[PDB]
Paper text:
Encapsulins are a class of BMCs characterised by their conserved subunit (Enc), which self-assembles to encapsulate enzymatically active cargoes and can remain porous to cargo substrates. The overall structure of Enc subunits across species with different T numbers is conserved and consists of a peripheral domain (P-domain), an axial domain (A-domain), and an extension loop (E-loop). T = 1 encapsulins of Mycobacterium tuberculosis, the causative agent of tuberculosis, and the closely related Mycobacterium marinum, are known to encapsulate the DyP as a core cargo with iron storage ferritin protein (BfrB)28 and FolB as possible secondary cargoes. In vitro cryo-electron microscopy (EM) single-particle analysis of the Mycobacterium tuberculosis encapsulin was used to obtain three structures of the encapsulin shell in intermediate states, as well as a 2.3 Å structure of the fully assembled shell.
Author numbering:
A (entry chain LA), B (entry chain UA), C (entry chain OA): 1 to 265
């Protein structure tokens, strides 16, 4: 067995298939970051750091010796525990199709939110700079009126053009901004369609982020490094409940500072 | 070896591939001129002039002798030096993917700007007349209001129609004008889309030019002659930096005076 | 080419072969550490850190999220520059066999001394704990009289026996201690032979270390990780001299605290 200790969990095979399906579905729906960044293959469990290729000056060991430390970025392992009713698990073999997988959905939504907020806003404790912090283009303010959203977005499209950047540009919106441009309409279309006319990429719902992000998806600018992708593991169990977790280990690198514009309220 | 002296540069193979990729990418993005003019095959290093096929009267050598000089256009070699950190070059073999290629990008942007400004505004010292100067159609004034841009552009489309010209017409805009028609919107579309409806060619971002240019891309009207295309060459190096250059040799010919309209502010 | 920039050096092929032979020979003679520790295959230039498999508690990103940083050990790149006369280099093609390779020998001796002192005494700036510091067995004092050396060494052999350890034990001596037990004799043998009778391993000359070390060579206790093994690289040159360097990148790990005894004066 492995670190998931999956065979020790009192979960049947059919219940496991339903839990895997629910977690994978809810996660994909709430991920916006993997649609725009380069996603590496999983390195594996032993992978601990990503080389940046830079060098750090250290106090010379002896006379005439020049020493340099190799710089690297550590992976962070992110774990979201959740708790399942054993009655709901037992219902699945009897043929129930409405078993309560709400904790699985909440854990997948929380893991997806962490991953997206780590990619776009950073996680300083894990030495990850967000796309918002690593952007060299000027930051823009989103207006109160949703009918004035496409104007400011177009100004962001000016800045990537002034930065000398090609590629399909894509706009990612926070859930508040996505709702505002979805529910306001002008001439038989919502403002989301007006945003769709400005770019050759995609208007992407990004419920974890704040503000908005416009960026190129030409490739090679944004890199998500995975040691291991999302997995479900077993912690402990009692007569009534099974404690499990969702787990993934990653770091994020931004190679190109001028490939994005961040917007705030 | 050749005049690039490329093997003498202290640049690794992987670093060379990254520099070539960065320079080629940034150059294409900033070229507008090659999308509309006929571009010849590279003549080669020995190519020095392009025959125009005209004749120049010279003082008769002797009695009964009629002499004429063949007219030609000289090529100009354009060189943009740039300077790279050797630490950034050394980072590439160690696996860095964020090496500072800003000087390469600035050199490619500057070379592209020179080439486009030479094609459209001319370079008198190199005996190159620009498209703006060689146009026989009347010049138009671009209005201050971007909502009045498509009107004047349509008047330019009248002039090529009054000049008796067929073919897909294409509109090239300066970066100021492109930004103005991109960021102003009317009825759910930016003014750039309104320009796109007027022509069967393309709205082309041309950040080097001034004003705007409307012209036919039927072929055979505008000819860019290349002796050698863009190449990267090695000048000199020290402990910290490598001096290199971008280099291209060309001339530009406009055969058809009535195939274009220039616009100014 | 690579980071060594070897083809840029004004060094002939025969001179290169002599320099490689001299450096490799002098290095092996002065290495004691690789004879007793496990030496990994070279990871390669991109390798920057070694995973330890441990976890570091970090401030929770959000509520209900448990985060942990993966622990790792950075590699250190160690570079010893040296300077060669170009006349000595030119002598080699003419058939000289006494070309002055003293700087190569001094650079190889200095690199070997650094590597051995890093393995056995540590390099705190590179986060490397030495075998002396990581040993859990008690430290012993070497006596002034060399005839009393084998007694104390035998007490060290008691401690590894009290630590519950098997395997061929090996004794490494500093150059002072090796000279003292080599030059003092008892009953027709030097004291080095008396040390040789106590162990089934080897009396190893270790000129870089202080004191003495007794340890098991059963395997899996001491691990030297190499990104890249010893290589010769080219820095710069003038009319008279060529500046080159010896370079290696490594870290050292001690997995088993009770597998060694350190001795001091």
């Amino acid at each position: 067995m492995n670190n998931l200790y999956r065979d020790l969990a009192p979960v049947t095979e059919a219940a496991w298939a339903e839990i895997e399906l629910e977690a994978a579905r809810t996660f994909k729906r709430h991920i916006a970051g993997r649609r725009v960044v380069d996603v590496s293959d999983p390195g594996g469990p032993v992978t601990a750091a990503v080389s940046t290729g830079r060098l750090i000056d250290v106090k010379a060991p002896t006379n005439g010796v020049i020493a340099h430390l190799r710089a690297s970025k550590p992976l962070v392992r992110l774990r979201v525990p959740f708790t399942l009713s054993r009655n709901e698990i037992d219902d699945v073999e009897r043929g129930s199709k409405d078993s309560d997988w709400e904790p699985v959905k909440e854990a997948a939504k929380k893991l997806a939110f962490v991953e997206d907020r780590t990619i776009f806003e950073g996680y300083s404790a894990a030495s990850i700079e967000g796309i918002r912090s690593a952007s060299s283009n000027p930051a823009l303010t989103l207006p109160e009126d949703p009918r004035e959203i496409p104007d400011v977005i177009s100004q962001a499209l000016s800045e990537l053009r002034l930065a000398g950047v090609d590629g399909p540009y894509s706009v990612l919106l926070s859930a508040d901004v996505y709702t505002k441009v979805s529910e306001t309409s002008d001439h038989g279309y919502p403002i989301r369609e007006h945003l769709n006319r400005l770019v050759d990429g995609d208007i992407i719902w990004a419920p974890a982020i704040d503000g908005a992000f416009v960026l190129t998806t030409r490739g090679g600018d944004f890199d998500l490094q995975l040691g291991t992708d999302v997995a479900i593991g077993y912690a402990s169990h009692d007569t009534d409940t099974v404690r499990l977790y969702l787990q993934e280990t990653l770091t994020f690198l931004c190679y190109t500072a001028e490939a994005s514009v961040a917007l705030s309220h």
